[PDB]
Design a protein around this ligand. Structure first.
Ligand SMILES: *[C@@H]1O[C@H](CO)[C@@H](O[C@@H]2O[C@H](CO)[C@@H](O)[C@H](O)[C@H]2NC(C)=O)[C@H](O)[C@H]1NC(C)=O
Ligand SMILES: *[C@@H]1O[C@H](CO)[C@@H](O[C@@H]2O[C@H](CO)[C@@H](O)[C@H](O)[C@H]2NC(C)=O)[C@H](O)[C@H]1NC(C)=O
Ligand SMILES: *[C@@H]1O[C@H](CO)[C@@H](O[C@@H]2O[C@H](CO)[C@@H](O)[C@H](O)[C@H]2NC(C)=O)[C@H](O)[C@H]1NC(C)=O
Ligand SMILES: *[C@@H]1O[C@H](CO)[C@@H](O)[C@H](O)[C@H]1NC(C)=O
Ligand SMILES: *[C@@H]1O[C@H](CO)[C@@H](O)[C@H](O)[C@H]1NC(C)=O
Ligand SMILES: *[C@@H]1O[C@H](CO)[C@@H](O)[C@H](O)[C@H]1NC(C)=O
Ligand SMILES: *[C@@H]1O[C@H](CO)[C@@H](O)[C@H](O)[C@H]1NC(C)=O
Ligand SMILES: *[C@@H]1O[C@H](CO)[C@@H](O)[C@H](O)[C@H]1NC(C)=O
Ligand SMILES: *[C@@H]1O[C@H](CO)[C@@H](O)[C@H](O)[C@H]1NC(C)=O
Lengths: 172, 324, 324, 172, 324, 172
């Protein structure tokens, strides 16, 4: 996709992450597991909710066919009425069908951007305290216990705190 | 071999498909179908109010009072009108109905009539009023449209016929009248005595006259003659005047519009069932909260918007990507 | 603690809001409102050319010459026509005007007439031409539509009335005529002497006839009789012929179309003010360079495009993000 | 947003940068200050100018309602005329409203792309002569005076020129 | 100075331009023009089936049998009809044709007629049938529309004229008749003997009558009189009855609809050429697989969709960027 | 453009790469040359093929003008017919013209995303075994012969295989 993350450098999705759209898998001495990123998921959810409302609300006044009848000496008027009601019908079918294809494309790319953005947020915070493995994972140069993991996951990882230890480990 | 954190995305067992611009048939984790495709196959009350079921009668059969339409002599308020494609019971005495489609269009904004006896039959003291036809027979005897009066010769005379009604009913009133175009002269004389007759109708805005046409025509329901009907909406406080030396088919009644609103005539061969809906189509009733439907373009009530689409499914989740 | 360079983006005090697909009510640094929502509340000259203000007259009152419309006997070129919803002064002698809406539609492409005296009254030497009605009274005396001639009996005779005009004016010419449908026989005889009359009009393409209808009708402006008017656009070099044994209401004039162009009839109760515009609506004039407006759908002149929207604001700048 | 820069890794906008949409804040021994990037701003300005013209020019022929009248025996024709003029009105309202929501989304993302792109342009030029702080700022490993700053800002920063000094400083 | 790998993109010599939202006139490596702008300038057979070329005849001239239209007395199946803007040969005896546009609209779904001699001339034994006019002269002698019969006085009498036809042809049948409105009384008497005449037509659904109008009109093709024509589609197994004391212009023929389908009348001054197409326009034929065209809005056959655009070019490749 | 690669950090296109949209130029001891990336090109080709079909197929039922005629006493009906046929014509002209401008923008950005994505794929695989020059090229820290190049080009470059050699070379 457009942002290169979903079905991209992050090769597959996670069946085991059941409580949100995007998130984390961690692995340390204490063990491993999945957790959704609540903030990115909530933002995406609000965005998508707004989108569906907007598409729907923009087609609340479309054309409505009114039943009318015409005599056998009113064929031109009948055909005009038919062409007209058919015409609007075709316009609204096209509008609904196009809007949906276009917004589906954007929706899928929006999720892809959100994953890439979360990845970059984490990356740009860990800096050189980690190895970037290339598959969506970062390998730490310092031991990172459960509380350390939680600081990463909520955006309060302390780079200066681990700078000295990682640098030594990265070099020996 | 250090500790790791990985960024990733949800996947589930969803097989929901969507289309996009670049790719068709994409599996996504969540999707929203926005197109209603189902209905209950029934004709229903609309918000508790039953349609007017014409059965075998046409709008004309109803309003003229074709004797085969007697169940409709008094009807309550309706939510829509059900008419068959080709109702059997219309003009039993054959003829025509001027501006008939315009009258049907009026019915789309009317939800009830009160039928008012504007020109009681008993008041035509100088004319015979019991005239009927085998074409409108009832129990083997000649009869006639229940709402109309066939004025004929009395004591071998037909004096000038004049009737007048001032619409004091409080609403606009639909009034129908006709002119009889006989098959031949023997018919014109036996019925009306006079030759060279006319039928004149006048209100403040309408001035409409007919001279009857005697002419040989193919028999319809056994009759070579024809009755040509016309109508007007008589305004409040306006007067309609009828005047005739013969061939007048007078209304006895007027239909006061007693309820106005969004309505319509639905073409259907079906019958009303004991069911309730907010949105009726000719195929059946819809009950959905979805914004679109593809059931039928001609709906009545509070309806989704119609489109020709076979499918409309919005992606809400992401691409559902198989595990590694 | 080294030197630094930082990449960043503009922010200001803007509170301009826009909507997007994903989010409503977004503050941006710059925005462009593309919807005109205001007008001056006045009816104005359009490009220096004043409308034709009918005041209390209808199009029919004007063209027939209802004496209450005398200010309109000669009018200069106009840019649009202002007509009230229900003008008081139309057919002062009551009746009808055939194809009247079609005539009004013609006026949408006409910007001036020259009224031409095609059939001078003085030339009806075998008929009385001074006939009027209390329905068109002027200063307490019976009078008549200024543009028309009521031909009646002279010396207890009404010889066949024939008038003819060849359109040599250089443009298509609008011509109106009428037929009087009397209330009764005493009226038919006192006015026309003859009974069993007709009014015939013929050009190269039109052949239109009437036999007058004597019939009792409710009084309108005091009159049970009616005048039914008709019109034609007489082509250049074509001839119109009138022929009648009675009941003819003849034009004395024709209206030569002297200026053609985009125009129209605006329905309004208002009056022309001393102001100037390029775009007139029934609510007032618009003066904008914006591409859209939401003022009123029925505009005349060089106008923005109309939409129902309450707002249309394009983002031009970026998201306006509070300082850190 | 879609490109992760605006209200993203670059947390806020700059009130003090008054002469363009995107740009720089520098800090050295000589002092500090803001400057717009003229080239990226001009390109964005030309793009946005074209966009507004294009939306406008695409709706120069839309429907116009013509006043017509109808008798009381022409109700079907009147309703047809009404449904028609209403129908086009609703089509154009939808077209204008949709086009604007869709293009607003794209406009906001376009600015976001432009900021990310300018950031990346600077980053990909400075390479390892700087620390990437993660907030839109780069910290230099070599002293970078006003003239050096100007080379960065106009895309002519000389990496080889400072390579040796930075590498030494980065290591000690 | 190590080994290198570089990522890059295609560039070629393309000068194909496209527009986008942000930028006009962009050069791209590949592009797809989706708008057909060319046609062959010819009128052609449509799928092997030639149009009906009316030449100088109007639809009315054809169906009435204006003698200048004799090449059209029997025509084979057509794919469209070519008519000139102002054909010379229509009503050679002047007059009018009621519901003429409605008849032309019927022709859009008809692709062939079989002309059936429904009322053979020889069967009018009590009337003269050889009547014609200098207005329809052939080789210097008075003649008449080939499909119609001008019934006149025989032995100074005109008995009631009655003709009848039951449509047993197997399809709906178009039937045309007329009424002669004379210039004067001498004409009415010399032709019909009777005064105060009528023409009556009746089927199961139509009842249409005329009384002829004697009136002075400008000469058209030398004639002050007029023939007013009317038509009906006679249903299968229905009967049409004609009845007249004078002034009847009877059909001798009916046109049975023998082939139905999508067709139409194309307005053109051109002539059929020896060429073949799937899509005909008034400017010429289109042969393309492109989805859109901008040639002309009025096309017949299997056509691309029409748009007003001067250009529609989709980018398929990428921005074509000059070498470094 | 939106993704910053085409006419971006990769300054120009390659005339010498004639067999696809995106690809590689390599340079080693064995020599140099161009090669298209078949997989990214094929995916883009399938995407673009689908897009053109979709735009076309969505306008297969648009309005068609039917020739009708009107008498001189039917001017209102004639004008209604005209306004209607004109109205749909203008709607479909706008629809076709807009769809094309919008999809052209997306197409050009799609190619740009595809190039950036291919670049990132290669980058995220080579990791620190190469110098990122900033112009779309990577300079190797280990000798990379033709077979090594082919592993990069098909996504099977072996980072562990060259890790030791590159690290030594990067440091001395
Ligand atoms: C028809 O009936 C009405 C109701 O009695 C007559 O009387 C008045 O008519 C006006 C006309 O609009 C009504 O508004 C009033 O309700 C009536 N008011 C008074 C004071 O009489 C009307 O005149 C009758 N028409 C005729 C021709 O006799
Ligand atoms: C009506 O007036 C015209 C103008 O005098 C008459 O004369 C000619 O008519 C033709 C018809 O189109 C005009 O083009 C010319 O201007 C006139 N030319 C000549 C040489 O006379 C016309 O004949 C008159 N109609 C009748 C019935 O008398
Ligand atoms: C007109 O011709 C038909 C065909 O002979 C007549 O006879 C029947 O008419 C019905 C009416 O729909 C047709 O379906 C049949 O083909 C005929 N069947 C039989 C058994 O006769 C028809 O009656 C004729 N009309 C008149 C008035 O005589
Ligand atoms: C984030 O996570 C840490 C680590 O568990 C926790 O102690 C802290 O309260 C959280 N801080 C914020 C700002 O949410
Ligand atoms: C869509 O995809 C499914 C499974 O991925 C496949 O079985 C099927 O062929 C496709 N369906 C259609 C209608 O093309
Ligand atoms: C929009 O945002 C403003 C300030 O950010 C807020 O005060 C207001 O509630 C919002 N307006 C609407 C109409 O929702
Ligand atoms: C860019 O900036 C430098 C440093 O101030 C200046 O000397 C030079 O002339 C500029 N070069 C270009 C190519 O704009
Ligand atoms: C488009 O670009 C070409 C070459 O890049 C240039 O010569 C020309 O001026 C432009 N064409 C138009 C119509 O603006
Ligand atoms: C990829 O390229 C290598 C190097 O030429 C080749 O040996 C191998 O078979 C290819 N592998 C795959 C999985 O395509």
């Amino acid at each position: 996709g457009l942002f290169g993350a979903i079905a991209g450098f992050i090769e597959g999705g996670w069946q085991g992450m059941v409580d949100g759209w995007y998130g984390y898998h961690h692995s340390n001495d204490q063990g491993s597991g999945y957790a959704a990123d609540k903030e990115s998921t909530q933002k995406a959810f609000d965005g998508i909710t707004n989108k569906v409302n907007s598409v729907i609300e923009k087609m609340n006044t479309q054309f409505e066919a009114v039943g009318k009848e015409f005599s056998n000496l009113e064929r031109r008027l009948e055909n005009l009425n038919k062409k007209m009601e058919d015409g609007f019908l075709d316009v609204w079918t096209y509008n609904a069908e196009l809007l949906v294809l276009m917004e589906n494309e954007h929706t899928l790319d929006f999720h892809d951007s959100n994953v890439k953005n979360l990845y970059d947020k984490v990356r740009m915070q860990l800096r050189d305290n980690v190895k970037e493995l290339g598959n969506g994972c970062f390998e730490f140069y310092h031991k990172c216990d459960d509380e350390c993991m939680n600081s990463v996951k909520n955006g309060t990882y302390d780079y200066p705190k681990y700078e000295e230890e990682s640098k030594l480990n990265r070099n020996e | 071999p250090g500790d790791q954190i990985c960024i990733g995305y949800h996947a589930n067992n969803s097989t929901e498909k969507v289309d996009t611009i670049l790719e068709r048939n994409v599996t996504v984790t969540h999707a929203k179908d926005i197109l209603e495709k189902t209905h209950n196959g029934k004709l229903c009350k609309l918000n508790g109010i039953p349609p007017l079921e014409l059965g075998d009668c046409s709008i004309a059969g109803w309003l003229l009072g074709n004797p085969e339409c007697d169940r409709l002599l008094s009807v309550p308020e309706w939510s829509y009108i059900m008419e068959k494609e080709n109702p059997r019971d219309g003009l039993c005495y054959p003829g025509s109905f001027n501006d008939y489609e315009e009258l049907k269009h009026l019915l789309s904004s009317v939800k009830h009539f009160e039928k008012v006896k504007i020109l009681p039959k008993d008041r035509w003291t100088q004319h015979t009023t019991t005239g009927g036809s085998r074409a409108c027979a009832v129990s083997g005897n000649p009869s006639f449209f229940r709402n109309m009066v066939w004025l004929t010769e009395k004591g071998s005379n037909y004096p000038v016929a004049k009737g007048s009604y001032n619409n004091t009913s409080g609403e606009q009133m639909l009034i129908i009248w006709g002119v009889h175009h006989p098959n031949d002269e023997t018919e014109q004389r036996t019925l009306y005595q006079n030759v060279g007759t006319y039928v004149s109708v006048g209100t403040s805005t309408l001035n409409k006259r007919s001279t009857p046409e005697i002419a040989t025509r193919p028999k319809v329901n056994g009759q070579g003659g024809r009755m040509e009907f016309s109508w007007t909406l008589l305004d409040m406080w306006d007067t309609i005047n009828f005047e005739s030396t013969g061939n007048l088919i007078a209304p006895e009644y007027g239909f006061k519009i007693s309820k106005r609103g969004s309505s319509g005539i639905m073409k259907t061969e079906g019958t009303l069932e004991n069911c309730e809906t907010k949105c009726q189509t000719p195929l059946g009733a819809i009950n959905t909260t979805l914004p679109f439907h593809n059931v039928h373009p001609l709906t009545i009530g509070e309806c989704p918007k119609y489109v020709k689409s076979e499918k409309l499914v919005l992606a809400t989740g992401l691409r559902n990507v198989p595990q590694i």
